[PDB]
């Protein structure tokens, strides 16, 4: 009956305060109570907030929750940010019949300056096209925090069929890297004016475009 949408990512410094929103797509957010779960890499999830704003035993008072009726949204707030708070956070609610989870929000506790991603985009090689295949290669590097969103475009129109995207990975220099691949047939590549790779990081978008006319 509904969805819960959270930001892909949020970040702040040790000691500062940060907030994660969770917006209900349909019906009032106050119709059904919200839970918030913490999940660390490897680890299974842990309740941090239940019943909109209640804390399970052993959850520090740094963690709290609230409801915003005007925006039909729930929110998790973490003050006195500490490096160990770094994790994925999922809001959760109920349909009266089915459990609904939010998309997830990667929380980064900053340890170095924010860093915009460098984007390099390559068109199909002449050699690959000769083989009746076609692959657009978008290489993303040097971005911190390690959270990006990648969108592909044929002209203006979004593309999701034939898109393969990795999760970010730590580079040798402690920043992150990722890559995304678009698979086309030579004709699909030949019959559009251009294709674009769109990398959203911390709100702003970085973009690169290639065209079959060089």
């Amino acid at each position: 009956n509904f969805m819960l949408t959270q930001p892909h990512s949020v970040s702040e410094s040790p000691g500062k305060t940060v907030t994660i929103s969770c917006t209900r797509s349909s019906g009032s957010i106050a119709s059904n109570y919200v839970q918030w779960y913490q999940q660390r890499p490897g680890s299974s999830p842990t309740t941090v907030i239940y019943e909109d704003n209640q804390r399970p035993s052993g959850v520090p008072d740094r963690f709290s929750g609230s409801i915003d009726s005007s925006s039909n949204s729930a929110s998790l707030t973490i003050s006195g940010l500490k490096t160990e708070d770094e994790a994925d956070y999922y809001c959760q609610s109920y349909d009266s019949s089915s459990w609904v989870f939010g998309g997830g929000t990667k929380l980064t506790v900053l340890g170095q300056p924010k860093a915009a991603p460098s984007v390099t985009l390559f068109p199909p090689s002449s050699e690959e096209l000769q083989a009746n295949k076609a692959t657009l290669v978008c290489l993303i590097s040097d971005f911190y925090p390690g959270a990006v969103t990648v969108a592909w475009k044929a002209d203006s129109s979004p593309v999701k069929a034939g898109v393969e995207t990795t999760t970010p990975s730590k580079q040798s220099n402690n920043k992150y890297a990722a890559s995304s691949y678009l698979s086309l047939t030579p004709e699909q590549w030949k019959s559009h004016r251009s294709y674009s790779c769109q990398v959203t990081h911390e709100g702003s978008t970085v973009e690169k475009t290639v065209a079959p006319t060089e």
């Binding site: 109570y33 839970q35 239940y50 997830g104 390099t120 050699e127 990795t166 990975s169 890559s179």
Partner: protein, 219 residues
């Protein structure tokens, strides 16, 4: 003293059947709903279904109905999730969790998942060993690289000019595709002036398939 202990990791193949388990200790297993939750690689938590072990009352999320089979054996406090015919897209982590989460005002109702299993990673692949296919990626400073495409399994080694060239080399972690095969890219950043007077060759080695390719990358 509550514990949900799930069965071990699964290495399986498409078309095969699978049945994983979750065993509850430290509480009345027939007195609580047990839920199943999926989490695919690098993605979020999706609720699959729920069962009351007391009488096998079962309900499925609409996005899973008839796709999977949930059951329980109360005598041994054990809940099961089960596929009759796996797809590689079934590759995920799977948790069981107890519906033990209560709100104070309601002494009958139960609303959220409080205790979670440790998780059971399920890996499914119909891919057999295969050598990569390599393609050149042509160019104050310039960028060139190699597309190493459609191979299995990891790892694959990439060097440039037989190892002589290390500076500016960035070999990207491989993407795992829905076909079951991997691909990666290696990129080296070099001064544009050198483009006309220096040869650049990527060297790809893949031991499991004994594939050895050298690609010249040209302007």
């Amino acid at each position: 003293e509550v514990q949900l202990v799930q069965s071990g990791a699964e290495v399986k193949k498409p078309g095969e059947s699978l049945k994983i388990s979750c065993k509850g200790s430290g509480y009345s297993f027939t007195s609580y709903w047990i839920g199943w939750v999926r989490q695919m690689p690098g993605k979020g938590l999706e609720w699959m279904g729920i069962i009351y072990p007391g009488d096998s009352d079962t309900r499925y999320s609409p996005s899973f109905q008839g796709q999977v089979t949930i059951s329980a054996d109360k005598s041994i406090s054990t809940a099961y999730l089960q596929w009759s015919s796996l797809k590689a897209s079934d590759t995920a982590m799977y948790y069981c969790a107890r519906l033990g989460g209560r709100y104070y005002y309601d002494s009958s109702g139960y609303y959220y998942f409080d205790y979670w299993g440790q998780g059971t990673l399920v890996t499914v692949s119909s891919a057999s060993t295969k050598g990569p296919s390599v393609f050149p990626l042509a160019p104050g400073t310039a960028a060139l690289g190699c597309l190493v495409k459609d191979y299995f399994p990891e790892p694959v080694t990439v060097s440039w000019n037989s190892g002589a060239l290390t500076s500016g080399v960035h070999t990207f972690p491989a993407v795992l595709q829905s076909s079951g095969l991997y691909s990666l890219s290696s990129v080296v950043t070099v001064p544009s002036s050198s483009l006309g007077t220096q040869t650049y060759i990527c060297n790809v080695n893949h031991k499991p398939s004994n594939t050895k390719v050298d690609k010249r990358v040209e302007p």
